[PDB]
């Protein structure tokens, strides 16, 4: 009737944790000329076999609003963008007064022809040049005459992006380092917070396109059964409402003008690439959304919001007036940065047909203050040629603001709100393979990794090797990957050192001389080896775990030797 | 070098009696040189009392 | 003084290097620093009073 502690190595027990993740890309996905801004050449090529092990009898609490993976992805995207722009031309000589004339189309001065005096590569020669700029890039200086300055030159240094750096989003996979795993929620209509029943284990996640846009989510992924309204509290209108669509809505954005690309040499080894002449007429950049498809998209959204917000009248408003970078829809495609008024999409009351296409006006801005940050700015060089965007609308970010009505507006906060839309299904967990259980002695279908997590302690103990095998295996990703590898090695070696002290370094399961104390768990073996999962068992003895290890070191080898 | 470690410390009261004022001269975008403008009050020597 | 003229002067360090200005937000107040042994090594301390 006496029980003794037994040490099990390879236990399918995991706990919520934060850790540095690494990137993977599908093949090189470059021609050696694009030099993608996301540094995809430094990522590990993906494994063609995605694994994907469904965990039976595992229900796990997920919370998309406290997911460390979102904060880490946002940090990595900012770090990569800063590292990419760093080795490029700094446009410090351009904080000069611009003499700008309005360009008369054959808009109302949207393109200005600005002349200015700058140095050449020879420093002692001063050249008068001209360039075309968008109205949003030039701010009046002093009075209302033709004198202008660049929007941010007075407070920060504008860095010209290197013309060889592509901004095309390419799907990026975030794989966890050895010793950690990513759990995926496979529920068809997941609320975004709460227990998930269909949980699978996957070392990497699907490809995520790091698309930078606001108000409307582009590309990414769609819902499987219906439009899902996520949000956090819903009563508190301060929280962002993330809307995932079932079907995509095609959005055809374009810039019709055919500008030239004039290279103005600024100094030794440095050139400014700007817009030269306009070939053809001047036509407004715009975006086409099918009217009927958007109509049904809002019909589905209003139905779901009405269900969530009780039977109130839903009214959609456009954003307030203000700086285009704040209040307009924004996106980058083709290498060009578009800002669109987005006022024809949220202008209706649903309660309880002039044209079939919604054409949104858009503007182009070359000086972009991205990531809601000031003190740094980028100049976007001209692309040359017409731009065809042809993107998919797959989700919305809505915010909420009194006669029995609720007002929703396009909006959202920082870019983390977009990453949640893709990361809502994933959680990062740390593996702790070493567990202890009572046994009577003194001193299968090949389920995949953690497939026994929902199994009883018995039968789960027959898969210790499956979990055991997954403990192993100068830029942003290089050093982080090296740190992850060293830390995984340290974790493995620490577990091996503990087993070596216990004398179990060569054993997956070892029985010690320490008797089981009934104060730890006054339960029979049938009450422990059946019914309980390893997760429940580690929870029940968590507050006593440190005591058991002490006895093993205090006894066994310390005396047996 | 002879390092002398004392049994008891000796209190040293050092003062810079002048107040001055601080002015910013801009050098470039977002950056400035910080220097003294006009001295307020009398000119008194900085000194230490032991 | 950079010339016989008794009204011409230059920064003391200018002629040899570019002078870096300390950021005013940086405090120079000393804070206790402890050195800790890395894994594989140990730090011994002598407790002899004299």
């Amino acid at each position, epitope marked *: 009737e006496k029980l003794w502690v037994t040490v099990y190595y390879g236990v399918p027990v995991w706990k919520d944790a934060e850790t540095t993740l690494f990137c993977a890309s599908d093949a090189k996905a470059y021609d050696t000329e694009k030099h993608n801004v996301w540094a995809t050449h430094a990522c590990v090529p993906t494994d063609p076999n995605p694994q994907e092990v469904v965990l039976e009898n595992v229900t796990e609490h997920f919370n998309m609003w406290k997911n460390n993976m979102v904060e880490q992805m946002q940090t990595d995207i900012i770090s990569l963008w800063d590292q990419s722009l760093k080795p490029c031309v700094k446009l410090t000589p351009l904080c000069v007064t611009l003499n700008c004339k309005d360009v008369n189309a054959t808009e109302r001065g949207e393109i200005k022809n600005c002349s200015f005096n700058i140095t050449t590569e020879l420093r002692d020669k001063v050249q008068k040049v001209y360039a075309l700029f968008y109205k949003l890039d030039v701010v009046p200086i002093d009075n209302n005459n033709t004198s202008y300055r660049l929007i941010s030159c007075d407070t920060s240094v504008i860095t010209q992006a290197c013309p060889k750096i592509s901004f095309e989003p390419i799907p990026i996979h975030y794989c966890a380092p050895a010793g950690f795993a990513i759990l995926k929620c496979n529920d068809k209509t997941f609320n975004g917070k709460g227990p998930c029943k269909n949980v699978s284990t996957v070392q990497c996640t699907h490809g995520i396109r790091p698309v930078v846009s606001t108000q409307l989510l582009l590309n990414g992924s769609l819902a499987e059964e219906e439009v899902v309204i996520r949000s956090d509290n819903f009563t508190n209108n301060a929280k962002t409402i993330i809307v995932q669509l079932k079907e995509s809505v095609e959005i055809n954005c374009t810039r019709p003008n055919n500008y030239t690309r004039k290279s103005i040499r600024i100094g030794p080894g440095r050139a400014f690439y700007t817009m030269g002449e306009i070939i053809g007429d001047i036509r407004q950049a715009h975006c086409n959304i099918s009217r009927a498809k958007w109509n049904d998209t809002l019909k589905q959204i209003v139905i779901k919001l009405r269900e969530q917000f009780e039977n109130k009248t839903i009214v959609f408003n456009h954003s307030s007036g*203000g700086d285009p970078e704040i209040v307009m829809h924004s996106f980058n495609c083709g290498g060009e940065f578009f800002y669109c008024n987005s006022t024809q999409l949220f202008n209706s009351t649903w309660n309880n047909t002039e044209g079939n296409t919604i054409t949104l006006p858009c503007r182009i801005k070359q000086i972009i203050n991205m990531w809601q940050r000031v003190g740094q700015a980028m100049y976007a060089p001209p692309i040359r040629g017409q731009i065809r965007c042809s993107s998919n609308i797959t989700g919305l970010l809505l915010t909420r603001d009194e006669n029995g009505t609720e007002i929703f507006r396009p909006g959202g906060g920082d870019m983390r709100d977009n990453w949640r839309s893709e990361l809502y299904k994933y959680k990062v967990v740390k593996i702790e393979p070493l567990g202890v259980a009572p046994t009577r002695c003194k001193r299968a279908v090949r389920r995949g990794f953690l497939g026994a997590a929902g199994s009883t302690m018995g039968a789960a103990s027959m898969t210790l090797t499956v979990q055991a095998r997954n403990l192993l295996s100068l830029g942003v990703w290089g050093i982080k990957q090296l740190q992850a590898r060293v830390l995984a090695v340290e974790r493995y070696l620490r577990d091996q050192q503990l087993l070596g002290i216990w004398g179990c370094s060569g054993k997956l399961i070892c029985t010690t001389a320490v008797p089981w104390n009934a104060s730890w768990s006054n339960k029979s073996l049938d009450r422990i080896w059946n019914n309980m999962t390893w997760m429940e068992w580690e929870r029940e003895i968590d507050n006593y775990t440190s005591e058991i290890y002490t006895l093993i070191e205090e006894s066994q080898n310390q005396q047996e030797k | 070098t002879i390092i002398v470690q004392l049994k008891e410390s000796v209190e040293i009261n050092c003062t810079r009696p002048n107040n001055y004022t601080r002015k910013s001269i801009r050098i470039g975008p977002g950056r400035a040189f910080y220097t003294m403008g006009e001295i307020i009050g009398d000119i008194r020597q900085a000194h230490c009392n032991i | 003084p950079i010339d016989n003229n008794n009204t011409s002067y230059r920064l003391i360090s200018c002629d040899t290097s570019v002078i870096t200005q300390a950021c005013p937000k940086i405090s120079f107040e000393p804070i206790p620093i402890h050195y800790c042994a890395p894994a594989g090594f140990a730090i011994l301390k002598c407790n002899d009073k004299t």
Partner: antibody
Amino acid sequence: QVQLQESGPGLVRPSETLSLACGVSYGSVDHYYWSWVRQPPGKGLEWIGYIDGYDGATNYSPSLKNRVTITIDTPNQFSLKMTSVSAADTAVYFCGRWNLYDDDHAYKSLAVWGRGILVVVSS
Amino acid sequence: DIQMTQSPSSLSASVGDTVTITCRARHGVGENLNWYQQKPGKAPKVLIYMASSRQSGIPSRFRGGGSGTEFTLTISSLQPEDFGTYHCQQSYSYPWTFGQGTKVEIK
């Protein structure tokens, strides 16, 4: 330690021009963004506008842009001239210094405030 | 012209507890949010600069934090002198608007 002090009339008529001076004591009008902020009674703070110190360029809040002129009249004083006042403009007006140089403690916050002058618009 | 909402609009607490004040921007602003303390009859004092950092001379009890649209000011071990109206300010985009402010009373 630079201090600022507002000076001006307490009452202005509903159709006259309001002129408020801000003196600088232990300092001068150096290369910071010198600005004015309004506090209507019972309300939060409203920005009026700022003027630079490196040059004479100014930047006013759009909603008051056509009603506000800010100039510097001497190294130790600058002033706010707000035309076409109305009853809605009754407020405590604060003078302050907006620090923009990053290497200091206020990377972007009004860091030296005055004491505040109450201006009442009435007949 | 980003509009700011602060919550709660009226706050009270005993000496020594830990309290929070939430400031919400209509639009995302990164970390460019300041916090100020205005005592009755006096001009406001700067407490928090870019969302999380403190002004020298302000005790560690006043901690900030947050980014994007949700910012908080946490006042631990609240003392009798920490009475007055707290304001948040947007440094991201001109006009640098302010919230209406939350009054903190001592009980």
